[PDB]
Design a binder for this molecule. Structure first.
Ligand SMILES: CS(=O)(=O)Nc1ccc(C(=O)NCc2ccc(Cl)cc2Cl)cc1
Ligand SMILES: CS(=O)(=O)Nc1ccc(C(=O)NCc2ccc(Cl)cc2Cl)cc1
Ligand SMILES: CCCCCCCCCCCCCCCC
Ligand SMILES: CCCCCCCCCCCCCCCC
Ligand SMILES: CCCCCCCCCCCCCCCC
Ligand SMILES: CCCCCCCCCCCC
Ligand SMILES: CCCCCCCCCCCC
Ligand SMILES: CCCCCCCCCCCC
Ligand SMILES: CCCCCCCCCCC
Ligand SMILES: CCCCCCCCCCC
Ligand SMILES: CCCCCCCCCC
Ligand SMILES: CCCCCCCCCC
Ligand SMILES: CCCCCCCC
Ligand SMILES: CCCCCCCC
Ligand SMILES: CCCCCCCC
Ligand SMILES: CCCCC
Ligand SMILES: CCCCC
Ligand SMILES: [K+]
Ligand SMILES: [K+]
Ligand SMILES: [K+]
Ligand SMILES: [K+]
Ligand SMILES: [K+]
Lengths: 276, 282
C-alpha cells in the first residue's frame, strides 16, 4: 500500500498547518493588542498637528494643504538613492532576500532586471552562504575540541555536556553577532538599545521590514563602517541560519515529547475509567 | 573528524565564489544606477519645481517650517496616516486581520514592512515571534512541498508512460523538468498575476514583479496584495494566502533547480578555462 504512506504524510502536513494557522491567530491577537492603541494615539495627534498648522499659520488656506499632501505622498514614491554605492547596497538586499526596500526600482527596466537579477543571484549568494557556514562551522568545531577536553576529564560526563556545548554557541554567538553589533549601531546610527537588537534580528532572519536600515540616514559614516556591516551580514546570516535551524530541531524534540505525553494522559484516563 | 587537507580545498572554493558574488554585486549595482539614476534626477528636479511654486506663493509660511512640516508628515506616514479633511476617518492598520497578515510577513520572512511594530512591546514580541515562527513555518512549507511534490510525481507517472515510443532514461528527465517549469509558471506566476492585474489594478509587469519579489521572499513591499482600501471580495485575500503557502514551496524548488544549473555551469566553465589555456598557447 502506497496511498497508506501518503495518508500518513497528509495527516502530518495538516496538523502542522493548523499549528501554523493557530500560531498566526495567537500572533495576530497579540500584535493588535500591542499596536491598535498606539495607532489611535498617533492618529488623534496627527489630526491635532494638522489643524494646529492651519491656526498657527493663517496664511494657509484649507484647500491648498490637501494639495501639498498629495504632492508629498507622490514623492514618497521616490524618496542620492541610486548613487555608485547604494545601488551596490540594493543588489545586496536582492540576493540575500533581506529586501529592506527603502530603495526599490521604479523604471520598468529596473523591475525586469531585478526579476532576472534575483532568480540568478539568490541561488548564487546561497552557495557563498554555505561556504561561509562551512568555514565558520569548522572554526567553532576546533573551538569545542579545546573545550570538550578540559571539561571532559573530571566532573559530570557525557550526554549532558552536549547541552553545555550548545549553550556556548548561542551565548558567544549572541555576543559576536547580536550584542556587539547592536552596541555599535546604537552609537553610530543613534538607535535605542531595543531598536538595534530589533534591527539585527529582523535583518539577520532576512525578514527585513526596513523600518530601520544601517547606513540609511544622512550621517557622516566612517569609511570603515558600512563595509564592516557587509561582513557582519555575510557572517551573521550564516549564524542565524544555524540558529533558526537549531530552534527547528528543538521543535521536533518538543513535538515528540508532547505527542507521547498526550498519549500518557490518554492511557491513564482509560484505565482510571475502566475502574468502576 | 575534520582534516586540513579537505578544508584547504573548501576555502579555495569559498573564496572564488565570494569574489564571484562581489563581482556579481558590482555588475548589478552599475546596471541599477544606470537604470534608476536618470529617473531619480528628473523626479528630483521636478520636485524642486513643485517646491518653489509654493515656497514663494506663500512667503507668510516660515519656510524653515515647511521643510519641518514634510519631516512631520513622512515620519508619520510610515505608521500609515491619511491626514486629510475630505477623508478624516481612517481604517485601522492593526485591525483583526491585518495583524494576522503582519504575523504572516514575519514567519515567511517576506516582510513587506508597510506595517511594522512601533510599540517597544511589539518589537520585543516580534523578535520572539520570529525566532519561533520562522522555524515553525518552515516545517509547514516542507510538508506543503512534500505533498505538492508527490502530486506532480504521480503526474509524471502518467506522462512518462504514454511517451514511451521507439526514449532514454536520463533524457526524459529533461522533458519532466520542462513541464514543471511550464505548468508551474502558469499556476503560480501567470494565472495569479492576471488575477492581481484585475483586482489590484496593477499593470502586467507590476503583477509579475510582485509575484517574484514576494515568492522569493525578497518582499520590498513597494507592492502589496490587499494593501489598499478598495473593495476586496474576501474570497480574494484567503486565496492569496493559499497562493503564498503553495507558491513559496514552488519557488524554493525553482530557485534550488537554478542552483544545480549553476553547479553544472561552474563545472563546465572551470574545465573549459583549463582547455582554453592549453589551446590559447597553441
Ligand atoms: C537610502 S540609501 O540606500 O541610499 N542609504 C544606505 C543604507 C545602507 C547602505 C548599506 O550598504 N548598509 C549596510 C548593508 C549592506 C548590505 C546589505 Cl544586504 C544590508 C546592509 Cl544594512 C548603504 C546606503
Ligand atoms: C493596510 S494593510 O497592510 O494592513 N492591508 C492588508 C494587506 C494585505 C492583506 C493580505 O492578507 N494579503 C494577502 C497576503 C496574505 C499573507 C501574506 Cl504573508 C502576504 C499576503 Cl500579500 C491584508 C490586509
Ligand atoms: C539596442 C539597445 C536595446 C536596449 C534598449 C535600452 C534603452 C533603455 C530602454 C529600457 C527598456 C526596459 C527594458 C530593459 C531590460 C534590460
Ligand atoms: C529554461 C526554459 C525557459 C523558461 C523561462 C521562464 C523562467 C521563469 C521566470 C518567470 C517568467 C514568467 C513568464 C512571464 C511571461 C509573460
Ligand atoms: C544573461 C545571464 C548572465 C548570468 C550568467 C551567470 C553565469 C554564472 C557563472 C559563475 C561561474 C562560477 C565559477 C565558480 C568556481 C567555483
Ligand atoms: C574569525 C573571526 C570571526 C568573526 C568575528 C565577528 C566579529 C563581529 C564583527 C561585526 C561587528 C559589526
Ligand atoms: C505585457 C506583458 C509583460 C511581459 C514583460 C516581460 C517579463 C520578462 C520576464 C521573463 C524573463 C525570463
Ligand atoms: C553575471 C556576471 C557573470 C560573471 C562571469 C564570471 C566568470 C568568471 C570566470 C572565473 C574562472 C573560473
Ligand atoms: C492521499 C493524500 C491526499 C488526501 C486528500 C487531500 C487532497 C487534497 C488536495 C488539495 C486540493
Ligand atoms: C523545557 C521546556 C520549557 C519551555 C516551555 C515548554 C512549553 C510547554 C510545552 C509542553 C511540554
Ligand atoms: C500554541 C501551542 C498550543 C498548545 C499545543 C497544541 C498542539 C497539540 C498537538 C497535539
Ligand atoms: C492541486 C494543487 C494546486 C491547485 C490550485 C492552485 C491554484 C492557485 C491559484 C491562486
Ligand atoms: C540583460 C542585460 C545583461 C547584461 C549582462 C551582459 C554580460 C553577460
Ligand atoms: C483582464 C483580462 C485580460 C486577459 C489577459 C490578457 C493579458 C495576457
Ligand atoms: C484578511 C481577511 C482574510 C482572513 C483569512 C483567514 C484564514 C484564511
Ligand atoms: C505538535 C505540536 C507542537 C507544538 C509545540
Ligand atoms: C470576529 C471579527 C473578525 C473578522 C474577520
Ligand atoms: K527572506
Ligand atoms: K525579506
Ligand atoms: K531562512
Ligand atoms: K523584505
Ligand atoms: K521591506
Amino acid at each position: 500500500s502506497d496511498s497508506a504512506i501518503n495518508v500518513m504524510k497528509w495527516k502530518t502536513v495538516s496538523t502542522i498547518f493548523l499549528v501554523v494557522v493557530l500560531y498566526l491567530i495567537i500572533g495576530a491577537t497579540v500584535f493588535k493588542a500591542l499596536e491598535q492603541p498606539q495607532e489611535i494615539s498617533q492618529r488623534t495627534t496627527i489630526v491635532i498637528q494638522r489643524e494646529k498648522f492651519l491656526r498657527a499659520h493663517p496664511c494657509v488656506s484649507d484647500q491648498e494643504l490637501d494639495e501639498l499632501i498629495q504632492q508629498i505622498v507622490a514623492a514618497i514614491n521616490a524618496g542620492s538613492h541610486w548613487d555608485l554605492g547604494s545601488s551596490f547596497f540594493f543588489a545586496g538586499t536582492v540576493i540575500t532576500t533581506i529586501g529592506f526596500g527603502n530603495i526599490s526600482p521604479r523604471t520598468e527596466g529596473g523591475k525586469i532586471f531585478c526579476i532576472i537579477y534575483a532568480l540568478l543571484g539568490i541561488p548564487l549568494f546561497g552557495f557563498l552562504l554555505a561556504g561561509v557556514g562551512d568555514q565558520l562551522g569548522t572554526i567553532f568545531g576546533k573551538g569545542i575540541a579545546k573545550v570538550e577536553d578540559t571539561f571532559i576529564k573530571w566532573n559530570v560526563s557525557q550526554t549532558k555536556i552536549r547541552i553545555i556545548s550548545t549553550i556556548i554557541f548561542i551565548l558567544f554567538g549572541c555576543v559576536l553577532f547580536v550584542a556587539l553589533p547592536a552596541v555599535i549601531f546604537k552609537h553610530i546610527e543613534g538607535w535605542s538599545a531595543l531598536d538595534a537588537i530589533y534591527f539585527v534580528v529582523i535583518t539577520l532572519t532576512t525578514i527585513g521590514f526596513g523600518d530601520y536600515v544601517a547606513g540609511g540616514s544622512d550621517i557622516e559614516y566612517l569609511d570603515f563602517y558600512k563595509p564592516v556591516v557587509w561582513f557582519w551580514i555575510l557572517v551573521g546570516l550564516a549564524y542565524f541560519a544555524a540558529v533558526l535551524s537549531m530552534i527547528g530541531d528543538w521543535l521536533r524534540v518538543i513535538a515528540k515529547k508532547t505527542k507521547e505525553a498526550v498519549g500518557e494522559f490518554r492511557a491513564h484516563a482509560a484505565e482510571w475509567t475502566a475502574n468502576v
